Point group: none
Chain length 62, copies 6
Amino acid sequence: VLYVGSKTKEGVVHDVTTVAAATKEQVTNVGGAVVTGVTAVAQKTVEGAGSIAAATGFVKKD
Amino acid sequence: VLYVGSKTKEGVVHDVTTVAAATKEQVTNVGGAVVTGVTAVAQKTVEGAGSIAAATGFVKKD
Amino acid sequence: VLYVGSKTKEGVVHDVTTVAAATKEQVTNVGGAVVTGVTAVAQKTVEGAGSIAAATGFVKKD
Amino acid sequence: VLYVGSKTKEGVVHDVTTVAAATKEQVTNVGGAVVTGVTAVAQKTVEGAGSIAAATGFVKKD
Amino acid sequence: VLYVGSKTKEGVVHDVTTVAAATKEQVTNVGGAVVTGVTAVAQKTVEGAGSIAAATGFVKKD
Amino acid sequence: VLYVGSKTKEGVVHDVTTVAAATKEQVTNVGGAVVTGVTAVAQKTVEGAGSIAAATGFVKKD
């Protein structure tokens, strides 16, 4: 292996923009999850049994 | 293997734009999940039994 | 292995922008989670059984 | 005017590649010009009388 | 005018690659110019009479 | 005018790579110019009469 003048990108997020304006919002939540905003996860490795990687608004009522 | 002047991208998200405006919103949630916003997951590897990678608004009522 | 004049990026988030304006918001939460803001996770490795890496608004009612 | 999450490119050159190999070359030059290599000019504005912008192998024997 | 999360590029050169190999070369030059290598010019503005912007191997025998 | 989370690039050169190998070269020069190597000019403004901006291997035998 050998890289010359190169570039690598494994697991990236970029140039995420968000322009809200004049935003009203009501959220009545009970017990569950509410997610009303920008999100971004950047991981290289996740291993192992039962793994729950990069959840969002997760509810596990086992 | 050898890369010269190259570029790699494994598992990426980019140039995500979002222009809301004059947005009213009501959300009455009970028990379950609600997801009302931009999202982006960037992973390279996920392994193992039972794995639940990059969920969103997940509800596991086992 | 050998890199010359190169660049690597494993598990990164960048150039995350967020322009709110004139934002009203009410959130009545009981028991569950509410996430109403920008987020970003940057990890290289996560291992092991049962692992729950990079949750958000997680609720585990086991 | 207003740009959101945009990109502009005025007068650009990019991704110029060149793979020579086992190249012999003789060049006997007298008085004139010889150009035997990759070239690229990037300008936004050039004005004025008599202007000679981005010449290559130019010979002006006025 | 107003840019949000944007990008501009006026007069740029990039990602110029050059891979020579096993290259013999003889150049016998007298009086004139010889240019046997990668080149790149990046300007935004050039004004005025008689201007000679970004020449290469130029010979002005006025 | 106003930029938010933005990026500008006026007159730039970047990511210039050059991989020579096993290169023999003879250059017998008399009076004129010889240019056998990578080059890059980065200017924002050049003004005025008679201007000669970013020459290379120039020979002015007026």
